mmCIF file of all heavy atoms in Angstrom:
data_model
loop_
_atom_site.group_PDB
_atom_site.id
_atom_site.type_symbol
_atom_site.label_atom_id
_atom_site.label_comp_id
_atom_site.label_asym_id
_atom_site.label_seq_id
_atom_site.Cartn_x
_atom_site.Cartn_y
_atom_site.Cartn_z
ATOM 1 N N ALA C 10 -23.208 -3.742 -5.157
ATOM 2 C CA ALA C 10 -24.340 -4.527 -4.774
ATOM 3 C C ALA C 10 -23.861 -5.847 -4.066
ATOM 4 O O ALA C 10 -24.299 -6.185 -3.005
ATOM 5 C CB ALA C 10 -25.262 -4.870 -5.881
ATOM 6 N N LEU C 11 -22.836 -6.499 -4.691
ATOM 7 C CA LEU C 11 -22.280 -7.662 -4.167
ATOM 8 C C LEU C 11 -21.518 -7.381 -2.829
ATOM 9 O O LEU C 11 -21.697 -8.164 -1.878
ATOM 10 C CB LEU C 11 -21.338 -8.281 -5.168
ATOM 11 C CG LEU C 11 -20.698 -9.505 -4.532
ATOM 12 C CD1 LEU C 11 -21.796 -10.603 -4.424
ATOM 13 C CD2 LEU C 11 -19.539 -10.047 -5.337
ATOM 14 N N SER C 12 -20.937 -6.226 -2.698
ATOM 15 C CA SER C 12 -20.353 -5.846 -1.437
ATOM 16 C C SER C 12 -21.329 -5.516 -0.368
ATOM 17 O O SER C 12 -21.071 -5.688 0.854
ATOM 18 C CB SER C 12 -19.343 -4.786 -1.652
ATOM 19 O OG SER C 12 -18.302 -5.236 -2.523
ATOM 20 N N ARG C 13 -22.446 -4.999 -0.801
ATOM 21 C CA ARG C 13 -23.543 -5.002 0.253
ATOM 22 C C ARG C 13 -23.940 -6.344 0.711
ATOM 23 O O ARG C 13 -24.012 -6.651 1.882
ATOM 24 C CB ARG C 13 -24.803 -4.287 -0.234
ATOM 25 C CG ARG C 13 -25.893 -4.140 0.755
ATOM 26 C CD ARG C 13 -27.269 -3.873 0.189
ATOM 27 N NE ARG C 13 -27.837 -4.964 -0.546
ATOM 28 C CZ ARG C 13 -27.958 -5.008 -1.931
ATOM 29 N NH1 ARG C 13 -27.487 -4.005 -2.638
ATOM 30 N NH2 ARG C 13 -28.532 -6.077 -2.450
ATOM 31 N N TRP C 14 -24.160 -7.291 -0.243
ATOM 32 C CA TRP C 14 -24.725 -8.626 0.032
ATOM 33 C C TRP C 14 -23.849 -9.512 0.824
ATOM 34 O O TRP C 14 -24.259 -10.168 1.700
ATOM 35 C CB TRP C 14 -25.187 -9.280 -1.345
ATOM 36 C CG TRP C 14 -25.916 -10.495 -1.117
ATOM 37 C CD1 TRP C 14 -27.115 -10.672 -0.621
ATOM 38 C CD2 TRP C 14 -25.459 -11.756 -1.502
ATOM 39 N NE1 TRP C 14 -27.392 -11.985 -0.544
ATOM 40 C CE2 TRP C 14 -26.463 -12.712 -1.033
ATOM 41 C CE3 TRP C 14 -24.296 -12.246 -2.064
ATOM 42 C CZ2 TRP C 14 -26.357 -14.120 -1.300
ATOM 43 C CZ3 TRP C 14 -24.063 -13.656 -2.244
ATOM 44 C CH2 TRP C 14 -25.084 -14.562 -1.858
ATOM 45 N N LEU C 15 -22.545 -9.357 0.506
ATOM 46 C CA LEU C 15 -21.591 -10.245 1.278
ATOM 47 C C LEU C 15 -21.310 -9.796 2.664
ATOM 48 O O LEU C 15 -21.035 -10.566 3.528
ATOM 49 C CB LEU C 15 -20.374 -10.368 0.513
ATOM 50 C CG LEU C 15 -20.511 -11.144 -0.794
ATOM 51 C CD1 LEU C 15 -19.108 -11.196 -1.585
ATOM 52 C CD2 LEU C 15 -20.961 -12.484 -0.576
ATOM 53 N N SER C 16 -21.515 -8.395 2.913
ATOM 54 C CA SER C 16 -21.278 -7.894 4.215
ATOM 55 C C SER C 16 -22.378 -8.191 5.210
ATOM 56 O O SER C 16 -22.245 -7.829 6.306
ATOM 57 C CB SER C 16 -21.096 -6.365 4.113
ATOM 58 O OG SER C 16 -22.209 -5.758 3.523
ATOM 59 N N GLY C 17 -23.369 -8.852 4.773
ATOM 60 C CA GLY C 17 -24.535 -9.192 5.656
ATOM 61 C C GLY C 17 -25.391 -8.036 6.023
ATOM 62 O O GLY C 17 -26.079 -8.123 7.094
ATOM 63 N N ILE C 18 -25.176 -6.972 5.411
ATOM 64 C CA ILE C 18 -26.249 -5.867 5.517
ATOM 65 C C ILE C 18 -27.538 -6.404 4.751
ATOM 66 O O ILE C 18 -27.450 -6.945 3.723
ATOM 67 C CB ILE C 18 -25.814 -4.499 4.911
ATOM 68 C CG1 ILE C 18 -24.638 -3.999 5.655
ATOM 69 C CG2 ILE C 18 -26.930 -3.640 4.759
ATOM 70 C CD1 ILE C 18 -24.097 -2.718 5.078
ATOM 71 N N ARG C 19 -28.637 -6.362 5.566
ATOM 72 C CA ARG C 19 -29.887 -6.718 4.959
ATOM 73 C C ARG C 19 -30.938 -5.559 5.180
ATOM 74 O O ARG C 19 -31.056 -4.930 6.238
ATOM 75 C CB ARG C 19 -30.450 -7.949 5.548
ATOM 76 C CG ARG C 19 -29.650 -9.174 5.255
ATOM 77 C CD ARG C 19 -29.758 -9.547 3.769
ATOM 78 N NE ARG C 19 -28.922 -10.684 3.410
ATOM 79 C CZ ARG C 19 -27.569 -10.567 3.017
ATOM 80 N NH1 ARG C 19 -26.995 -9.422 3.013
ATOM 81 N NH2 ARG C 19 -26.894 -11.608 2.773
ATOM 82 N N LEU C 20 -31.477 -5.126 4.018
ATOM 83 C CA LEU C 20 -32.474 -4.155 3.951
ATOM 84 C C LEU C 20 -33.737 -4.534 4.614
ATOM 85 O O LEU C 20 -34.042 -5.722 4.741
ATOM 86 C CB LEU C 20 -32.738 -3.716 2.556
ATOM 87 C CG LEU C 20 -31.459 -3.293 1.894
ATOM 88 C CD1 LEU C 20 -31.632 -2.959 0.391
ATOM 89 C CD2 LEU C 20 -30.778 -2.222 2.616
ATOM 90 N N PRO C 21 -34.575 -3.664 5.257
ATOM 91 C CA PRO C 21 -35.757 -3.921 6.011
ATOM 92 C C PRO C 21 -36.739 -4.876 5.365
ATOM 93 O O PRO C 21 -36.913 -4.897 4.119
ATOM 94 C CB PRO C 21 -36.457 -2.564 6.152
ATOM 95 C CG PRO C 21 -35.252 -1.600 6.360
ATOM 96 C CD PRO C 21 -34.245 -2.200 5.398
ATOM 97 N N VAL C 22 -37.313 -5.760 6.170
ATOM 98 C CA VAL C 22 -38.595 -6.377 5.758
ATOM 99 C C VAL C 22 -39.755 -5.378 5.492
ATOM 100 O O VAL C 22 -39.640 -4.157 6.068
ATOM 101 C CB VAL C 22 -38.959 -7.395 6.714
ATOM 102 C CG1 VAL C 22 -37.970 -8.486 6.876
ATOM 103 C CG2 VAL C 22 -39.349 -6.788 8.028
ATOM 104 N N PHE C 23 -40.744 -5.702 4.855
ATOM 105 C CA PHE C 23 -41.766 -4.840 4.457
ATOM 106 C C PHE C 23 -43.177 -5.343 5.130
ATOM 107 O O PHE C 23 -43.493 -6.466 4.924
ATOM 108 C CB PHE C 23 -41.957 -4.719 3.011
ATOM 109 C CG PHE C 23 -40.833 -4.040 2.459
ATOM 110 C CD1 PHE C 23 -39.768 -4.714 1.808
ATOM 111 C CD2 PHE C 23 -40.621 -2.616 2.427
ATOM 112 C CE1 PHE C 23 -38.682 -4.127 1.220
ATOM 113 C CE2 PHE C 23 -39.554 -2.013 1.909
ATOM 114 C CZ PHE C 23 -38.621 -2.795 1.303
ATOM 115 N N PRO C 24 -43.882 -4.435 5.845
ATOM 116 C CA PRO C 24 -45.217 -4.836 6.402
ATOM 117 C C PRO C 24 -46.244 -4.882 5.224
ATOM 118 O O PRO C 24 -47.104 -4.021 5.144
ATOM 119 C CB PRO C 24 -45.436 -3.707 7.335
ATOM 120 C CG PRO C 24 -44.787 -2.534 6.858
ATOM 121 C CD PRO C 24 -43.516 -3.070 6.163
ATOM 122 N N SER C 25 -46.247 -6.048 4.447
ATOM 123 C CA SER C 25 -47.115 -6.058 3.299
ATOM 124 C C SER C 25 -48.637 -6.120 3.794
ATOM 125 O O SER C 25 -49.408 -5.358 3.412
ATOM 126 C CB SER C 25 -46.820 -7.318 2.507
ATOM 127 O OG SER C 25 -46.754 -8.529 3.239
#
Side-chain angles (χ1 to χ4, degrees):
Chain C
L11 180 67
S12 295
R13 184 195 72 252
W14 185 70
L15 295 179
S16 57
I18 293 179
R19 292 293 174 271
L20 305 181
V22 302
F23 295 98
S25 56

